[PDB]
Amino acid sequence: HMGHIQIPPGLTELLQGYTVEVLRQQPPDLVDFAVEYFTRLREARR
């Protein structure tokens, strides 16, 4: 309430989605997987 801006929601779901596939796909490179996943996200929602 008091103040102005606070922890914005929506980031907890985006992270949990990554921590999931990351543990399932168990890719040899998480850095390259994060760049290939997020980058593909923007193309998904279109």
Partner 1 sequence: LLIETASSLVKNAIQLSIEQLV
Comparing CB distances to partner 1, the nearer of 31 and 46 is: 31
Q: Is 18 helix (H, G, I), strand (E, B) or coil?
A: helix
Smallest distance, Å, CB 43 to partner 1? 24
Q: What is the separation of C-alpha 21 from the centre of its chain, rounded to a whole number of angstroms?
A: 10
Q: Which residues contact 25 (CB under 8 A, 6 or more apart)?
A: 33
* 17-46 footprint of partner 1 as x/- string (CB under 8 A): --xx--x-----------------------
Binding site for a copy of itself (CB under 8 A): 7-8, 10-11, 14-15, 19, 22-23, 30-32, 34-35, 38-39, 41-42, 45
